[PDB]
Every structure is written in C-alpha cells, then in structure tokens.
Structure 1
Amino acid sequence: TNLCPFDEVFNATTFASVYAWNRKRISNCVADYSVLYNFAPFFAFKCYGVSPTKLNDLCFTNVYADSFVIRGNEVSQIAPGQTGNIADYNYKLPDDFTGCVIAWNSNKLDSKVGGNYNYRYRLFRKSNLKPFERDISTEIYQAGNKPCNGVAGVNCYFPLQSYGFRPTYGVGHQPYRVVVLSFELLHAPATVCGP
C-alpha cells in the first residue's frame, strides 16, 4: 500500500529551467488520480491516450513525472505534432504520446519584482530535437559560414536567453507551471496499475 510520491512534486519550492528537464521514474507504488480528478484547480487536465473517467484499472510499467515552467501562450505547444520554438529546440512530444498534461498559472510564486532571471530557454539550434531528448550544451550558435572562432561575432550568438518574468505582465506572458505525467507501458508485468 505504497502511495506514489506525486504530492512532494507539485508543491516544490522551485522547478528547473525549460531546457534542463527533470525526469523521475515512479514505479512499484499506488497512484490515485481521483484526488485531483474532482479538485480541478488546473486550467487544463488535457489528456491523450487514456480517458480520465475511471481508467486507472489498467496496468502500466513506469510513470514519468516531467515538470517545468514556461510562458503562458506556449502551453499549447506541449501537445503532439505542433511546431514552435519550445517544441523545436526545447522539449518534444511524439505524436503517439499517451499520458496527461496538466498546467496551472503560478505567477505568485514565480514572479519577482525587478524580474526573476533564473528560467532560461534555447532560441536557435543547428537542427531539431529528436523525441524525448536533452541538450544542455552551451557552445555558441553559429549562423555565419565564416568561422565563429569562439567569440561573439557577426552572425554568432549564445544559445540561451532569459524569460525575465515580472508581476505586471499579461495572461499570455505570465509564468505557467506544467507537469506531464506519462504512463509508459511495454511488454512487462506492469506492476504500476494504480487500483
């Protein structure tokens, strides 16, 4: 009768940057989604693959507890088959993804007067991300064919820029915290069913 530790994840003091995604494997416990199924604080309980209306009777192999914080308008891009900066160079969802995306506004915790500068994102990349992949490289991006030579130069730019969240922004620019619960199931006994 081990309760999966979903709790300590939602109310953590801080979440890492957009490009430094956090992965936790949750296996060999019991997870009950009926706690938040009726509560509904979230603007979106949008789910894909599994219907939230009492489908916890099935068995899954592992649970991924992806978590981060982004801008508001970009919440959409956390959806299958959509292309935008966040999708292109930051986090990816396969079209076939099964699991739940839940998001809420947390301006109050995140926003700081004078700006909060601890959340960052990668503007340009040589190519596109492949599925569920992490790039933490800080090497300078080069657009020019002439060599960058490792210095700031014409057509040479550092990859990451800061969100700079501030209290007086519109609903689109205000910080939104996103948690993606992915139910990974393969050919396995799948002890993580969550009765």
Structure 2
Amino acid sequence: NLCPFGEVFNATKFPSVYAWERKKISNCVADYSVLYNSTFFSTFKCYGVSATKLNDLCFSNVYADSFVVKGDDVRQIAPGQTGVIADYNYKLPDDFMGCVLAWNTRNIDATSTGNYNYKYRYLRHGKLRPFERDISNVPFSPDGKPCTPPALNCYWPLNDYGFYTTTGIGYQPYRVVVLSFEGSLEVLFQ
C-alpha cells in the first residue's frame, strides 16, 4: 500500500479559506521526503510534534485541510494566533497537534490582472470555533437585524483577496495544508 501524499496536493484547484476541504488521506504510508525539501515550501512548521522525527512517528491520522491564505495571513495560521483570517475561518485549536505547511503560489494562484476567486469571512456574528466550517452567505448587519443591501449597515460577509503577481511578499497567495496528526487508537473509556 504505497500512496502519494503530494500528488493530490499538486492539484491545480485549491479550496479557499471559507471553503477549505478536509482531504482525509489515511490508512496508508507515504514518503515524507518532500517535507524535508524546504526550497519549495516556505512555511515548513509543526506544532506539538517533531518536524524531523515526523517520519519516525507512525501515530498519525491525517486530517489534511487545504485552503489559500495570502502572504501576510500565513502567520495567522498558527495555534493560539488570531486575526482577520484566524477567527472567521478554519481556526487552529490551542492544543492542536500536527504540522502547518505553506508555499508561495504567486505564479499559480495569482494573476497579473487580479485573481479574486478565493473567499474569507471579513464579518461574522460570534466566533468561529476551531475545526468548525460554516457555509452561509447571508448579509450581515452589525446590530444583527436581517436586511437586504444596499440598505445601510447591511454588508456581505465573504470577501475576496486581490491576488496579484506584482504584490509584495506578504500579499501573495500561500496554499496551506493543515495535517492534523493524531493517534487513531485511544483508550478514553472502558
């Protein structure tokens, strides 16, 4: 049972932060040799687990979540970190175990004329819990009263990145896979 773990991740189409997709690639062994390669990655990082000894550790139940934050928002993808993207989108739990990966897809996911395909909730009522995804585009009012734009104080929650190939390093798109390594077998209760 040999399964690639970067071949799928080399997809031309990547989910946005609003519509991040949980690709459960589990029950198979793969070659982490790409993980070592940091020439192509730009945010090789881990939380609560060894980065170099991840290959040695076989207690992994990967819950890879893919989404496209921009350059300044890649630091937002960290357990215990909050921001515009980290509280209304996929929030990393404070005790999250796993690794967070990113690379500068400026050539692929950014266009010289502006790429606005990807989404993220600028406005929301309440706080999005970690591991929780909400699919809804209802207009938002700061008071909380339903309405219809262009009525004042009624906006659209989802917003799109102005992705370009000419922007600075912090304003270029970064694909993010969140590998939620976990031990499947747990003796929680009798």
* Alpha-carbon distance in 2 for matches of 1:96, 1:25: 20
CA gap 1:3/1:149 in 2 versus in 1, 3 angstroms? same
Letter in 2 for 1:115: G
Distance in 1, matches of 2:120 and 2:96, equals: 23
Change (3 A) 1:139 1:5: same
The answer to whether residue 167 in structure 2 is matched with residue 169 in structure 1 is: yes
Amino acid at match of 1:183: F
How far apart, CA to CA, are the structure 1 residues paired with 2:37 and 2:15?
Answer: 28
Structure 1 position 78, deviation (Å): 0.6
Equivalent in the alignment of 2:40:
41
After superposing on structure 2, the runs of 4+ consecutive aligned residues of structure 1 that deviate more than 4 Å are: none
Alignment partner of 2:185 out of 176, 184, 187 = 187
Aligned to 1:17: 16
Structure-2 change in CA distance of 1:84 and 1:57 (3 Å): same
For the Cα contact (< 8 Å) 1:115–1:164, is it kept in 2? yes
Residue 42 of structure 1 deviates from its aligned partner by 1.4
User: Corresponding residue for 1:192?
Assistant: none
Instruction: Give me the TM-score of the superposition, normalised by structure 1.
Output: 0.87
Q: Which residue of 1 aligns with 2:128?
A: 129
Question: What percentage of aligned pairs have identical amino acids?
Answer: 66
Shift of 1:104: 0.7
Distance apart, 1:54 and its partner CA: 2.9
Preserved contact between residue 23 and residue 66 of structure 2 (Cα < 8 Å): no
Contact 1:138 1:158 in 2 (8 A): yes
Does the CA contact (< 8 Å) of 1:61 and 1:188 recur in 2?
A: no
Counterparts of 1:40-189 in structure 2, within 5 Å, are: 40-60=39-59, 62-144=61-143, 147-188=145-186
Shift of 1:39: 5.4
Gaps of 5+ in 1: 190-195
Compared CA separation, residues 71 and 38, structure 1 to 2 (3 A):
closer
CA distance in 2, matches of 1:174, 1:39: 18
- Alignment deviations for residues 126-183 of structure 1 (CA, whole Å, 9 cap, x no partner): 01011200011111111136x4433431111111111121222111111111122111
The CA deviation string for residues 30-88 of structure 1, in whole angstroms up to 9 with x for no partner, is 12213431454212211112212234333325211111111101111111111101111
Q: What is the SS of the residue equivalent to 1:57?
A: coil
What SS does the corresponding residue of 1:19 show, helix, strand or coil?
coil
| Bigger shift: residues 89-98 or 44-53 | 44-53
Residue 13 to residue 152, structure 1, CA distance change in 2 (3 Å):
same
- Give me the whole-angstrom Cα distance separating, in 1, the residues matched to 2:54 and 2:4: 20
- Asked whether the 8 Å contact 2:22–2:63 carries over to 1, the reply is yes
Aligned-pair CA distance for 1:20: 0.2
Equivalent position of 1:193 in the other structure: none
SS of structure 2 residue aligned to 1:85: coil
Q: Distance in 2 between matches of 1:178 and 1:12?
A: 13
In 1: Cα distance, 2:168 partner to 2:57 partner? 41
TM-score w.r.t. structure 2 length?
0.89
